[PDB]
């Protein structure tokens, strides 16, 4: 089967909007086969360990509503995965789609030679949106690129000052490209690619005592710290809330040593935590702020790295010191400008706070009833996780929830934990259903384990 | 005009309003251009305004890009229309707002633009099938991402995961090379000014002259001797940002044989040369070389979507099977980017645009080389392959003069990141024959103007 | 500006001269200063004046006086409370070591390095029997920093196939100045100009076991597992910093728990200085690898040893050329070491080190009370001691004042002005009392000096 | 036994000038035992592979004459090993022993606080002995310490100028401490200890274009080369002679790129190649010269790093930046000064030119006659090598030479090669004996490869 035939077969599929039964049965086996032969057979296996029966091979087809997804069989799922923090303003949010639609009619990608208007507008808007002295935005295409940019700003500012050491925390996830992977803390994700960047070190998350010692020792030996990088709340780490006061203490510690503070809000950002940015909870201003995922409104890929003029100015003298080819393209800018408008207009952060309190209270109730299965439920706003007693019970919860057409999934740096990350637009009724779905799942799990 | 003390909501409202405008008034344009410049100075980068001043004359620096004109042209806020010989630096291979491409994206946007990353997502599966079929020999598996630097990051990681257990950690790249600006790709990238401020980079990255098989062999052999064995060699088939440097005949074939001999992986960076630009779908098809890993981006997104693809043999890509989360990316291979790439692949094959690049590139280069002969006064030489081309001038200034002059004649050109004497000529492969003649015409006109400028 | 031959000739005649009348003395001193400036390091002249009075800066040393003194070219005798920073544990020209070196010089000073050399095998036997527990094999080299290099290389060769590559040291630590040792050495000013050093060296505060556990734990979580931990039992160049009781034992257990190797650096604390033969004997702690030098050469030869368990050292068995050095374990060096071990054990010098050390520290602690004026505190263990002063200048003055009194002391590399007191373990009881009397008059003069201003 | 006991036995053995046949047997038995149990069992296996059953046990006991050694069984060996380049003025050279004795009577080790006069004298003498602008000496204890000082000198000089990279050559042996080992090029000596110092690269020895390339590529990528380090003739590499003009072109290349040139003459130095320093064959002045081995007259361990005032001055403001504890002690200096006197008085470097040519004439003659055994013979002054067809044949030669009481040994970075590296004081008569034995060895070797 030649390339031309495949693209042709592919374009027709793209132009369909519904599938008759045989078209659907045929599409499914294609997708599985091609996943096996040309994507990654191991994904099919993972999907199996977290589902029951032929559910593993559920093929997704379209958005059903703001908060639901429909597979090729017409089956509709309430989305509690949120694409791991992407779909904050729902699937195919009308305002974001319209913005992207309109801009596509003019220009989707720019020449990168001329001044592009929306980059300017998104930079102005993010300047306005962000705390304090954060003034300048570099645009890129992803969370990991966003962090690459932050690291490079820190390096360019700090290396002429003789500081080269970066401190991150264990449990941290910061991206998978090799620069970001150097801060990313999970052993498994790191070792096969060593050596990574030199001069990266890790302290326990949420522990200012340990961090203070890290910086002190680095100073004594002339390996002075250039920057500290952390998530305000560790995402892939299993939704780990630092003790109240931590972020502020990290901020003070960085001030004292003249280290930069990098906040990775790729997952906590754009309202997910009940505020626009998680750092607004303790009102901490980083020197550099990393955004992505939800910044594209569920429609476009985009990352943004926002820093003070003091830091960002290292890119002024030679503007080509850091670039990327698609970064801040018009479609992506359109999407993010829409998203920002939607979040503020509909006060989605406050909604995240209220829906989050509600779900977590529900999950904490269920935790009380099933301590044979559940360890604890935790979270802030619409970033939640349920930790289970062990991995297999976790994988069974995800499976039982999928069976009830509610999408959930695990976290990258914590195997016992299932995240709950719905769109901030999840309705009150859907919230209750998600609780009811979790209850049935736990009851079923009791039976399955009890007999076994 | 929109206040300094403006709420985020207000800014977003203002911006959403502008997005909805199909056409700009004169006084609307005057206001928008003022905002954009101001916000560039204050929120993007004041330096990029300074740069634009150095490749334009007078007020041209403030040119604000506004929309596609036709397939091969762009229109600024003033309504001025430009023939595009820049091509988003290798992006716009099938023109601006290519109908088939825009169509696919639009169609996919109606279903689901971004995926959950949990369920099996069909356009990923399909673009992987398509690419496996579009690529030489044993290239079978694809990883999808959002840019060329991500494509290269994935390539280096694949090599690393494959070679690490075999005890090999060293990477060989070439001077002049450009592979990205993320810190991993940047280790392979070769320009001193893009690298130094960010050192230390990845350890164990070394460089040899591009085109020099003996130099490479010496690198690999010496690394073998010292127990610093080479994991992979990474190179472009033709150095783009280096200034369109073509290697000697058989070099790629030779690099392949050299990699086979040493047990190194061969990575080909076709982020710029790929998707038909140099006269074939992939530049490695000119010598018929099969790399172990092939990097794609830029033009793969049809000039509508951002996308990167990293494609490898099953033998190499299998390092990702036991643990499919070993390497991931949030947005990678999302439905929009896939639809865009599938459409682009279809367009390219259908209209035989790789063959068009050969012919239109042959025509253009030939005319450029002719201008080179007539104006040795200003021009060092003209080189290229398919629609990837360069004019090298005798100065640095002359090249900026030429850029400035061509802009004045509403033809878009720009310089290369690793060569300050070179102006690239990188038009859509859909550039009409008429538009070619105009380009040479403008090139001649500019060279003439530049000649009399000296004689002031 | 003579010829090389002419220069060497002059030097040989000087080497033959055992006495210098007033004529030769001034010519010599003038030469030595001039050549230091032009061919050695003009900066040592600056430092020396920095810690001397008037024309004390130009004190050219000439020969040993007695066990515990040095005489300069002007016939000025100094009591040695410097000890070559831990070298002269058995005094200057100790007859038993001097003799053993002459006897060996008469036979063979250096060896072929191809035939089995007896004194290397004998010394290894002797150190096996002198060292704690499973410490069995010895690698011989020429200096403290060389012995640390061998120790890093052993740990590396052992832990590399086991997948561990990170090394933990302590701040305040000093392990040598060759670039491998320098990676574990902790003083910023000694390290910075020579970076990048070896990757994967990290530092925890000395004496803080919870801090060390966190570092090992975190390195583990991220897949940068610690191969080894290196430390001095007592930090020397750091300023005689004593760990809390049980800390060394806790480091041993922590290492045991993480499967990291323990490297104990006793280059300075070893050969009796702290009251035992090895400082690790106070708590009965067995390192996997133990480093020795300085005093191991009896004050006559340069030598270092790196001693390890058969477990660790066996990495060198299959390829005995994997780690070597050219002069390492030569007959002269071994002869000196064997004589030194004999003198220490026979004359019970570590027990003496305890007694004299206590006597001296008492003395300094009393002076500390009488002069909070000038003295922060005095601390020590055995004959490894330090007086810490208020100012770094107050202290330069103490050193400079003691020098006028023909008592020799000097600073410590890591800290700003702490004076180490590291006299031969053979300091007489009477000499001890003179050192305390001198310290007193020095502080007295310094106080008067602070007024009168 | 206790440690006191052992030390006592050892001090009795040291005082013994000669051995009873039973004392000899007991000493030999105990030496092999302690080598096995306390030194390295492998070195005993190594000796076996280069001796004929039983000879491996030989325990060396004393210098015989100036050019011979005597084992415990009174067996006397002509020394063509030279302690791998140590014994240039013979064993127990009377002028060197005398010097060391006399200084030992006064003060063997310095205080490191008072100015020690022989340090001054040796640094003066070295400054006189060295080419051109070489002026300042740092004294240490070995070749590898000498290379360490050289690397640090280059580092302290070049790091403030933005240059951190080092170029060495394949085949190179520069020492085994971890800084020097970073330059030392033999795979087998390097891998188990990696990661070494970052930024060390290797080009092939004697290839000038490959070095221009490496220097220029490093300039291009911003990894500018701080120093180039090389032996004038690779020693452990198998006596590898660069083409005429190579060394000088390397010096000019360094000038061109502003890299410091470090010449490692730890083995080639002090007369061995026919000149006092091998760099004198082409009148090259490095920025930093490294010396050791024979610098201590075959009596003391000593190393020296000599540099231009321009380079060495990096240690002037803080003379404590780089030290070693025993470096430059009166004994080592006395030995070094005596050795310089002997070599100059007796015209020994020149003797090495004549004797080397004469010995290489014999070996070249033998290579003609035994092409079944010998690939080629080569040398510069008294630094010679015989390359055989196999590693095997080489081992056999070393063994046959050992039976004949002529001591030779292989080279660390070359398996087919046997070094011939005698004192420069080797007599003409002994030169003829060495050639006779080599001839005999080859004969036995031949007739015994034929009974196979
Ligand atoms: C604990 C410790 N470890 C290593 C060294 C270095 O010894 P060296 O023989 O290579 O110099 C030392 C040495 N310290 C004092 C510096 C002497 C020069 N003033 C040590 O204490
Ligand atoms: C050229 C060269 N450079 C350094 C060294 C190492 O000096 P060392 O005094 O630390 O050993 C050498 C020495 N190699 C021969 C020793 C082999 C084992 N007997 C050298 O040739
Ligand atoms: C905290 C954090 N940082 C960075 C990233 C990298 O994002 P991407 O996968 O888009 O590169 C992620 C993705 O999950 C994340 O959760
Ligand atoms: C060959 C090559 N590789 C990689 C890149 C970088 O990819 P991106 O700019 O999309 O991150 C470029 C960009 O010009 C390129 O030409």
Numbering used by the authors:
A (entry chain D), D (entry chain B): 8 to 459
B (entry chain C): 3 to 458
C (entry chain A): 7 to 459
Could you share sentences copied from the article?
The structure of YgjG in complex with PLP and putrescine was determined at 2.1 Å resolution. The putrescine electron density was observed in three of the four subunits in the asymmetric unit. The putrescine amino group bound the PLP at two of the three active sites. The covalent bond between PLP and Lys300 was broken, and the Lys300 side chain was displaced distal to the cofactor. The weak putrescine electron density could be explained by partial occupancy in the binding site and/or substrate flexibility. Putrescine binding to YgjG is mediated by a number of polar and hydrophobic interactions. The substrate N1 nitrogen atom forms hydrogen bonds with the Glu243 OE1 oxygen atom and the PLP O3 oxygen atom. The substrate N2 nitrogen atom was stabilized by a hydrogen bond with Gln119*. The putrescine was also surrounded by several residues, including Phe91, Phe180, Leu419 and Thr332*, which contributed to hydrophobic interactions with the substrate. The overall structure of YgjG in complex with putrescine was almost identical to the unbound YgjG (r.m.s. deviations value 0.34 Å over 452 Cα atoms), which indicates no significant movement at the domain level upon substrate binding, in contrast to aspartate aminotransferase.
YgjG is a putrescine aminotransferase (PATase, EC 2.6.1.82). Based on its amino acid sequence alignment, it belongs to the class III pyrodoxal-5′-phosphate (PLP)-dependent aminotransferase family, which include ornithine aminotransferase (OAT) and GABA aminotransferase (GABA-AT). In this study, we determined the crystal structures of YgjG from E. coli in free and putrescine-bound states at 2.3 and 2.1 Å resolutions, respectively, to investigate the structural basis of YgjG substrate specificity. The monomer comprises an N-terminal domain, a large PLP-binding domain, and a C-terminal domain.
